[PDB]
């Protein structure tokens, strides 16, 4: 069976990981659907609001 986002096999990696062979773990939802972590990450990042700082208008980014 295949990841719902990238439509590549679960038993293999997502498109980012094919060339350089990085680890590409799977994740599961309570709804029972499985995705490559990398794929669902792109999804969740795009769908989530970009938060701002509680105290100013700037996008919230952690200082590293």
Residue 40 makes contact with Zn ion by CB under 5 A = no
Q: Enter the tokens of residue 55.
A: 């105290």
Give whichever of 17 and 44 is closer to Zn ion, judged by the CB atom. 17
Please list every residue from 41 through 60 that binds Zn ion, using CB under 5 A. none
Q: Which of 31, 44, 49, 55 binds Zn ion (CB under 5 A)?
A: 31
Give whichever of 14 and 44 is closer to Zn ion, judged by the CB atom. 14
DSSP reduced 3-state for 31: coil
Q: Residue 39 contacts by C-beta under 8 Å, 6 or more apart in sequence?
A: 3, 4, 5, 6, 14
Residue 39 makes contact with Zn ion by CB under 5 A = yes
Bridge partners for 35 per DSSP: 27
């Amino acid at each position: 069976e295949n990841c719902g986002i990238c439509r590549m096999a679960f038993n293999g990696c997502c498109p980012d990981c094919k060339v350089p062979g990085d680890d590409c773990p799977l994740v599961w939802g309570q709804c029972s659907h499985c995705f490559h972590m990398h794929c669902i990450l792109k999804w969740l990042h795009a769908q989530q609001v970009q938060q701002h700082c509680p105290m100013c208008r700037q996008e919230w980014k952690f200082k590293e």
